[PDB]
Structures are given as C-alpha cells and as structure tokens.
Amino acid sequence: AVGPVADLTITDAAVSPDGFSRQAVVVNGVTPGPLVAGNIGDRFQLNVIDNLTNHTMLKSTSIHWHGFFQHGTNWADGPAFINQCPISPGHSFLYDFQVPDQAGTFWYHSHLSTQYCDGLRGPFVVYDPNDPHASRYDVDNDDTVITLADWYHTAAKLGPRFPGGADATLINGKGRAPSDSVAELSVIKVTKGKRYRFRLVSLSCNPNHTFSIDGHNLTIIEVDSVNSQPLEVDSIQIFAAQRYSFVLDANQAVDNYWIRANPNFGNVGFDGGINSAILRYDGAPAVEPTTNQTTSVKPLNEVDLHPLVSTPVPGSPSSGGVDKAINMAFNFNGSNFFINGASFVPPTVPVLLQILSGAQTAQDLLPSGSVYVLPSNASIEISFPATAAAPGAPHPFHLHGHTFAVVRSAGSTVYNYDNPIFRDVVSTGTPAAGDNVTIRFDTNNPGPWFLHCHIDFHLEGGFAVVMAEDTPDVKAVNPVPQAWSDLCPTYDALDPNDQ
Ligand SMILES: *[C@@H]1O[C@H](CO)[C@@H](O[C@@H]2O[C@H](CO)[C@@H](O[C@@H]3O[C@H](CO[C@H]4O[C@H](CO[C@H]5O[C@H](CO)[C@@H](O)[C@H](O)[C@@H]5O)[C@@H](O)[C@H](O[C@H]5O[C@H](CO)[C@@H](O)[C@H](O)[C@@H]5O)[C@@H]4O)[C@@H](O)[C@H](O[C@H]4O[C@H](CO)[C@@H](O)[C@H](O)[C@@H]4O)[C@@H]3O)[C@H](O)[C@H]2NC(C)=O)[C@H](O)[C@H]1NC(C)=O
Numbered sequence: 001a002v003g004p005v006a007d008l009t010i011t012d013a014a015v016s017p018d019g020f021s022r023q024a025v026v027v028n029g030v031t032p033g034p035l036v037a038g039n040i041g042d043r044f045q046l047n048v049i050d051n052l053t054n055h056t057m058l059k060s061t062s063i064h065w066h067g068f069f070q071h072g073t074n075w076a077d078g079p080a081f082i083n084q085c086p087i088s089p090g091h092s093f094l095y096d097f098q099v100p101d102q103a104g105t106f107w108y109h110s111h112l113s114t115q116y117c118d119g120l121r122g123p124f125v126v127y128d129p130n131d132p133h134a135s136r137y138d139v140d141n142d143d144t145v146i147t148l149a150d151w152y153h154t155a156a157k158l159g160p161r162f163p164g165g166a167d168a169t170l171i172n173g174k175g176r177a178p179s180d181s182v183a184e185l186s187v188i189k190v191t192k193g194k195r196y197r198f199r200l201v202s203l204s205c206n207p208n209h210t211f212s213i214d215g216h217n218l219t220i221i222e223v224d225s226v227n228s229q230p231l232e233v234d235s236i237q238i239f240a241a242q243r244y245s246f247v248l249d250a251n252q253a254v255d256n257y258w259i260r261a262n263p264n265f266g267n268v269g270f271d272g273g274i275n276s277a278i279l280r281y282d283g284a285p286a287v288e289p290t291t292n293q294t295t296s297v298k299p300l301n302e303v304d305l306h307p308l309v310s311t312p313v314p315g316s317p318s319s320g321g322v323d324k325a326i327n328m329a330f331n332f333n334g335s336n337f338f339i340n341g342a343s344f345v346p347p348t349v350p351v352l353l354q355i356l357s358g359a360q361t362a363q364d365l366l367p368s369g370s371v372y373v374l375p376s377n378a379s380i381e382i383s384f385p386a387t388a389a390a391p392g393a394p395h396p397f398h399l400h401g402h403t404f405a406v407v408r409s410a411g412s413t414v415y416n417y418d419n420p421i422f423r424d425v426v427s428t429g430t431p432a433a434g435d436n437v438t439i440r441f442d443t444n445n446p447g448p449w450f451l452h453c454h455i456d457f458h459l460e461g462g463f464a465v466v467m468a469e470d471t472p473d474v475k476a477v478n479p480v481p482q483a484w485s486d487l488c489p490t491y492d493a494l495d496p497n498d499q
C-alpha cells in the first residue's frame with residue numbers, strides 16, 4: 001500500500017491484463033492502481049502528478065476518492081467541473097483531506113469523462129485499529145483486497161458510446177478474454193485454518209458482477225464503508241463502485257477453488273476460465289481449479305443487510321416524511337440521458353468555483369436545470385423510479401459527500417424506516433419490477449455534491465445532477481488552497497488538443 005502521504009504518478013503505458021496489449025492510463029505504472037491506505041483519523045496528502053501525453057485518453061485528469069465525506073474539503077472531491085477544473089498535463093495537484101469519522105473499503109478513480117475506464121482506478125482502504133469486526137478474522141492486508149474491473153480492448157473514446165460488455169472481467173488486475181485462453185489468472189493465497197477479511201471493490205465502469213467462490217460461504221461485515229451485522233451469503237451481486245468486506249474461513253481441503261465474477265452482460269459464464277480467478281490454499285499444486293460452481297442458495301439481498309450499530313433513518317416513518325423530497329425522472333434519447341428534463345453538461349466554471357464567486361441559488365448556478373439547492377441540517381428523500389425510458393438498467397446511483405439510508409431497495413416493495421442499510425452506491429433496479437428505489441440522508445456537509453449513475457458511459461451521456469448543499473456556508477466551511485485556485489486558469493490556458 002502507498003499513503004497516507006504519497007505521490008500518485010499518472011502516465012499512459014502499455015498493459016496486457018488479459019494477454020492483449022493496449023495503451024492505458026496507469027497509476028504508479030500499473031492498472032488497477034496501487035492500494036492507497038491509512039487509518040481512521042489520518043490526514044491524506046495524495047500528490048497527483050499528471051504526466052499524461054495521450055489526448056485520446058485525456059492528458060488532464062481529476063481524481064475522486066470514492067466514499068469519503070470530504071467535510072470542509074469539498075474542493076478535493078474530484079468531479080471535473082463540479083469540484084475542480086482538471087489537473088493539466090505536466091502539473092501536479094495535492095489532494096489533502098482528512099477521514100476523521102470513516103473506516104472501511106473505498107476506491108479512487110478519475111472523475112473526468114470516461115477516463116477511469118481506460119485504467120485510472122484503484123482500491124483505497126482505511127483501517128480501524130479498533131474495528132468492531134476484528135474478532136471475526138485473522139488476516140486483513142494488501143493481499144486480501146479483491147478488485148473487480150471490466151476491461152475493454154478498444155479505448156473509451158474510440159469504442160461504441162455505450163459498449164455492450166467488456167472483453168474481459170479482471171479480478172485483481174488479471175483475467176481472460178476469448179482472444180487468449182491461457183492468459184495468466186490471478187491467484188489469491190490463503191493458509192488453511194486462517195480467516196480472511198476480503199475487501200471486495202468494484203472498479204467497474206459498467207457491468208455489475210455476481211461474485212462467488214466455489215465451496216466457500218461468505219460473511220458480509222461491511223457495505224460501502226458502513227459496518228454491517230454479519231450476513232452469511234454464498235454469492236454477492238456487486239454493482240459498479242460498491243464495496244463489501246466479507247469473511248472467508250479457509251477451512252476447506254487444501255486445494256484450488258474457482259473465484260467467479262460473472263458480469264450481467266458481455267462474455268458471460270466461465271468457458272476457458274473467463275470471469276475467474278484462483279483461490280489457492282498454501283500447499284495446493286500451481287494449477288487451475290477443477291471445482292464446480294454450485295447454485296447460490298443464500299444470495300445477497302440488500303434488504304437483508306443492516307447496520308452493525310443502531311443508525312437512525314433521517315426524518316419520519318412515512319413516504320415524504322422529510323424536510324425535502326425530490327423525485328428523479330429519467331429520460332434517454334439514444335445518445336443522452338436526462339434527469340427531470342435536463343441532460344448534464346459540465347459548466348465552464350466548476351460548480352464549487354461558481355459558489356465561491358457568489359452563486360448560491362439554483363437560478364444563478366450553472367448548468368441551469370441540473371442543480372438542486374438543499375437546505376442545511378435537513379432530512380432529504382430522493383426517489384429514482386425505474387422506467388423503460390432509461391435503458392441500461394439496473395442503474396447504480398452514487399451520491400457524493402454522504403452515506404444514505406436505502407429505505408426501499410431494488411426488487412422490494414417495502415419501505416424500511418427502522419434499520420435499513422446505509423451505503424453510497426445503490427442499484428435503482430428495473431422497470432419490470434416496478435422499482436422505486438428511495439434513499440434518505442441529512443444535509444450536514446456544505447458543498448456541491450454530484451449525484452449520478454456510476455455507469456461511466458451513462459454519466460458521460462449526462463446522467464447526473466448536483467446537490468448544492470447549504471450554499472451560504474460553502475465558502476467558509478471549505479477554504480481552498482492556492483493550488484486549487486490555480487487549476488482553472490491553467491486548465492483554461494491549455495490548447496484543446498492538450499486536454
Ligand atoms: C493513445 O491512446 C489511444 C487509445 O488507447 C491509442 O489508440 C490505439 O490506436 C491504434 C491506432 O489507431 C489502434 O490500433 C488498432 O490496434 C489493434 C489492436 O492491436 C493489438 O493487437 C495487435 C495484433 O495482435 C496479435 O499479434 C501479436 C503478435 O503478432 C500477439 O502477441 C497477439 O496475441 C495477437 O495474436 C498487436 O500487434 C498490438 O500490439 C501493439 O500495440 C500495442 C498498443 O500500444 C503495444 O503495446 C504493443 O507494443 C504493439 O505495438 C495490440 O496488442 C490492431 O488490431 C489494429 O490493426 C488493424 O486495424 C487497422 C485499421 O486501420 C488495419 O489497417 C491494420 O492493418 C490492422 O489490421 C490497429 O493497429 C488501437 O486499437 C487503439 N487502442 C485502443 C486501446 O483503443 C493510441 O495508440 C495512443 N497513442 C499512442 C501514441 O500510443
């Protein structure tokens with residue numbers, strides 16, 4: 001792991017995670033990027049060095065630290081043209097923030113256009129020396145992070161606008177495509193008799209994955225950085241950008257067991273060892289598993305997840321029993337997505353910079369129709385009714401700057417105002433099911449926060465809005481460093497081909 005104080009150098013480089021060589025955006029020479037780690041309470045000073053030279057994958061960059069509240073450091077949140085102008089090539093930019101009140105599994109990724117699909121993404125763990133789940137496991141380290149990524153042979157700006165699946169699912173940076181049946185698989189080592197806290201992070205740009213491990217059950221103890229009660233499952237459907245910690249007890253026979261991550265579309269299944277990695281017990285031969293997948297009899301259901309500690313749902317136990325309720329009506333016209341009639345187009349002046357320059361109302365803030373001003377210290381309910389008008393479901397939505405209660409989950413008609421899980425990325429389900437996924441949060445974090453589909457190609461097509469929270473306190477609460485103030489003039493000074 002690198003961090004909490006570290007350089008992250010961004011370059012273009014040839015990679016071959018599935019035996020197919022292609023130029024990609026890499027972090028400290030690798031994609032997925034290295035694990036960044038620290039402890040609860042730490043100040044992170046992540047110096048992002050932009051040494052990119054390839055305009056097609058973008059020479060500029062901006063990095064989001066996914067899941068962190070960024071209270072008082074909204075300028076460091078990442079979304080290009082919401083919280084900063086991008087970092088320019090040949091420049092560095094210091095993200096400097098604290099994590100006083102969170103611990104769990106996170107990740108970092110480019111939040112500029114579709115650049116994270118081209119490889120700028122990696123895991124991020126904040127450890128708790130007093131973790132309430134510590135007694136459930138023996139090992140929790142760099143080697144118990146499991147990343148899932150969709151991998152494309154054609155670059156994000158060069159392929160279809162909305163790809164119909166990846167060429168390969170990568171598990172810990174490796175996996176197979178049909179073009180190379182013998183590409184090196186990832187191996188995750190376990191010692192028989194030891195218990196492992198596996199931190200499963202979806203770095204996916206698009207597909208979700210149904211994760212399971214042959215012959216082993218899993219005990220979920222964390223959901224998007226929120227400690228949960230232990231939930232035993234035998235498979236996990238994980239959506240783009242979500243995280244789970246699960247405990248695996250390595251108490252089976254010394255052997256090789258298939259790790260499976262089946263995408264919802266693309267090359268589905270396991271022919272030739274695609275969508276697979278290897279769980280290898282110390283002492284097992286260095287060969288492929290020959291284990292068989294068994295039917296999931298205890299799949300994860302989100303409604304079965306509950307916080308480990310008592311966590312009150314904002315507002316009052318009835319539909320709309322909050323200070324402010326907002327419904328998000330989805331539309332799509334073939335190239336662009338819309339929320340409540342507006343397709344998001346990034347403004348010239350980042351939303352935070354607009355607020356710093358005086359714009360405090362929806363009327364003054366750009367882009368018009370995409371910014372929702374929220375009152376301070378208020379309960380907010382947002383519903384995302386699934387509709388056929390918005391193809392590419394299930395759409396996992398992410399709210400920046402907050403965790404939220406999932407009062408109603410996908411595939412459920414129940415509203416849980418008592419003990420629902422809190423998380424930061426939620427599937428908005430499908431119209432076939434009549435889904436109306438509904439979340440609640442409190443506004444105790446002044447700043448503009450992006451709320452968007454985390455299928456990166458959909459974000460790109462405008463599937464996003466901004467929650468402009470407590471605009472009158474934003475400037476005072478979020479003092480910006482000189483380096484941040486320098487970003488926009490430097491970016492705006494660039495030749496378009498240097499962007
Ligand atoms: C900036 O970034 C962008 C986006 O990433 C990047 O864009 C690439 O742009 C190029 C040119 O337009 C695109 O090129 C196409 O690339 C196709 C895929 O090539 C791969 O496969 C090649 C063939 O593979 C086989 O053979 C080898 C050995 O013989 C074997 O190992 C394999 O198993 C397999 O059997 C392979 O040669 C190639 O490897 C080269 O390129 C990579 C990438 O850098 C490099 O790492 C290697 O060192 C090596 O140089 C690669 O693995 C290719 O099929 C295609 O060629 C056909 O189409 C053209 C159409 O014009 C025909 O005219 C031509 O005759 C071929 O039939 C073409 O070359 C590429 O797809 C884009 N990349 C992506 C990811 O979208 C820019 O290049 C970047 N800028 C800079 C300066 O790097």
Ligand SMILES: *[C@@H]1O[C@H](CO)[C@@H](O[C@@H]2O[C@H](CO)[C@@H](O[C@@H]3O[C@H](CO)[C@@H](O)[C@H](O)[C@@H]3O)[C@H](O)[C@H]2NC(C)=O)[C@H](O)[C@H]1NC(C)=O
Binds near residue numbers: 234297
């Ligand atoms: C993972 O969790 C699953 C679900 O809880 C466990 O499955 C249960 O496993 C036992 C086998 O150990 C099954 O019961 C046995 O069935 C056989 C054959 O029918 C019978 O001969 C035995 O007397 C015994 O009753 C049980 O049916 C099964 N439950 C299911 C599938 O719903 C599984 O064992 C757990 N795996 C591990 C590695 O702990």
Ligand SMILES: *[C@@H]1O[C@H](CO)[C@@H](O[C@@H]2O[C@H](CO)[C@@H](O)[C@H](O)[C@H]2NC(C)=O)[C@H](O)[C@H]1NC(C)=O
Binds near residue numbers: 320383384
């Ligand atoms: C999804 O849930 C939302 C929030 O409850 C529903 O929106 C409300 O609908 C009623 C009509 O029954 C209106 O009076 C309210 O103003 C709506 N709330 C808003 C706009 O915040 C919505 O209809 C549900 N959608 C589906 C498809 O069930």
Ligand SMILES: *[C@@H]1O[C@H](CO)[C@@H](O)[C@H](O)[C@H]1NC(C)=O
Binds near residue numbers: 333334
């Ligand atoms: C969809 O709407 C966008 C934004 O309003 C517009 O630019 C585009 O031409 C439309 N696309 C199609 C395929 O009709």
Ligand SMILES: [Cu+2]
Binds near residue numbers: 064241454
């Ligand atoms: Cu994210």
Ligand SMILES: [Cu+2]
Binds near residue numbers: 392395455
């Ligand atoms: Cu989407």
Ligand SMILES: [Cu+2]
Binds near residue numbers: 064450452
């Ligand atoms: Cu985001």
